[PDB]
């Protein structure tokens, strides 16, 4: 329809304020075309013209389905903007009007209502919880209450998954516990669907739900999703691997029993690839995940050893992006803090000393503290074998003693005390 292309806001207002439903329809279509242009769509000019209450009333026009669709699309693009722009849509009374449109017999209208509510919920915790209080979850889940997800239109299913992921998103506060329990069986079902975009957004939803206290993690782990998350951890698509690794990383911040479920599902077999992944963010999050597994029980540290992951940790400590190296330093300090003497001895035999010492040259106070604590734990294990001199020589040979010597004359209190202590105790 070339007749509704490049209208001015003034003309859109004239059409919408006419007492003619057809003129209102043409002007609403003209508004959605303005609001869907790639170059700076005039969202604030449409808001200032007072058009949001008119679009919201058009949502209720059951007799005119095209004006319901055009106004839903126009409002979706306004709600997609800034928090102030989403607020203007919510202030117009759009939330219950969009929820009423979820049960529409027109699939393209229903989908637009799903999209709009995803944008509103996606703004933050308060609008997410307001969408929930207006009762969006029951009609949203009803749209997915089919025997096989493959019968639904692809774009439609992707929009439903994405909107459900925004209802799972954000913290302070986290989503209501009862809302999470209501959504989780549909989420577990979407996590087994064959579409890469549905899988990515399902993983993102699971990653938000596992980002919190152990009670929140427990809700997810009890649904038996960990084996599916580990399978997706092995996917070829980076948009699937990224949220799958984030969810797994979040679960291992939980209890040692919750971490054990990740190990039992076969997650450690994927870490040789994840710890050498060419995408730095995958390497960083894989090493962060490793740090929270090495912070566990001695039998869990043993499974890290058995899977041949200690040479991979030496590798990341030797060469990686600094942020990944900082996570590796944490993984080593956690391993040395909770491991057996035999496990700590193994770490030295894998060559941890030289890369650990080279990272003392870093201009980061926290990594220096983490490495010095790891050295203390390594010496503590060497004290139990009477091999402190053998370790002292190894540290001296790679130029590690010269780096600890300079750390005695360091600005930070913790660095000064730990380095001075190591030299007067072992050098």
């Amino acid at each position: 329809n070339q007749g509704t292309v490049n209208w001015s806001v003034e003309d859109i207002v004239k059409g919408i304020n006419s007492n003619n439903l057809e003129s209102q329809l043409q002007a609403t279509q003209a508004a959605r075309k303005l609001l869907s242009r790639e170059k700076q769509p005039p969202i604030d000019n449409i808001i200032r013209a007072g058009l949001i209450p008119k679009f919201v009333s058009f949502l209720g026009k059951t007799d005119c389905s095209p004006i319901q669709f055009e106004s839903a699309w126009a409002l979706t693009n306004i709600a997609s903007g800034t928090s102030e722009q989403t607020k203007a849509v919510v202030d117009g009374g759009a939330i219950p009007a969009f929820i009423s449109l979820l049960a529409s017999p027109h699939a393209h209208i229903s989908e637009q209502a799903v999209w709009a509510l995803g944008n509103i919920a996606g703004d933050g915790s308060a609008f997410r919880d307001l969408v929930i209080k207006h009762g969006a979850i029951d009609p949203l889940l009803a749209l997915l209450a089919v025997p096989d997800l493959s019968t639904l239109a692809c774009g439609y299913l992707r929009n439903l998954t994405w909107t459900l992921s925004n209802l799972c998103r954000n913290k302070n506060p986290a989503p209501p516990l009862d809302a999470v329990e209501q959504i989780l069986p549909t989420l577990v079902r979407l996590l087994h669907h064959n579409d890469p975009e549905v899988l990515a957004d399902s993983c993102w939803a699971i990653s938000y739900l596992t980002d919190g206290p152990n009670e929140r993690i427990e809700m997810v782990v009890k649904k038996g999703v960990v084996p599916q998350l580990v399978k997706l951890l092995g996917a070829t698509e980076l948009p699937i691997v990224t949220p799958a690794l984030r969810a797994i990383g979040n679960i291992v911040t939980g209890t040692d029993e919750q971490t054990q479920k990740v190990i039992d599902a076969g997650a450690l077999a994927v870490f040789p690839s994840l710890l050498t992944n060419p995408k730095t963010n995958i390497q960083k999050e894989a090493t962060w995940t490793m740090s929270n597994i090495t912070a566990g029980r001695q039998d869990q540290i043993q499974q890290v050893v058995n899977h041949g992951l200690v040479p991979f940790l030496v590798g990341v400590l030797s060469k990686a992006d600094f942020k990944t190296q900082k996570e590796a330093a944490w993984a080593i300090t956690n391993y040395t803090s909770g491991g057996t003497v035999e496990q700590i001895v193994y770490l030295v035999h894998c060559g941890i000393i030289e890369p650990l010492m080279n990272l003392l040259s870093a201009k980061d106070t926290k990594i220096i503290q983490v490495i010095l604590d790891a050295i203390s734990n390594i010496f503590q294990a060497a004290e139990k074998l009477g091999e402190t001199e053998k370790l002292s020589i190894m540290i001296e040979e790679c130029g590690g003693l010269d780096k600890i010597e300079a750390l005695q004359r360091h600005e930070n209190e913790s660095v000064y005390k730990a380095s001075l202590n190591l030299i007067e105790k072992y050098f």
């Binding site: 693009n77 709600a79 997609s80 903007g81 995803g118």
Partner: peptide, 6 residues
């Protein structure tokens, strides 16, 4: 990934 326009 937050909000999306159509």
């Amino acid at each position: 990934l937050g909000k999306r326009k159509y």
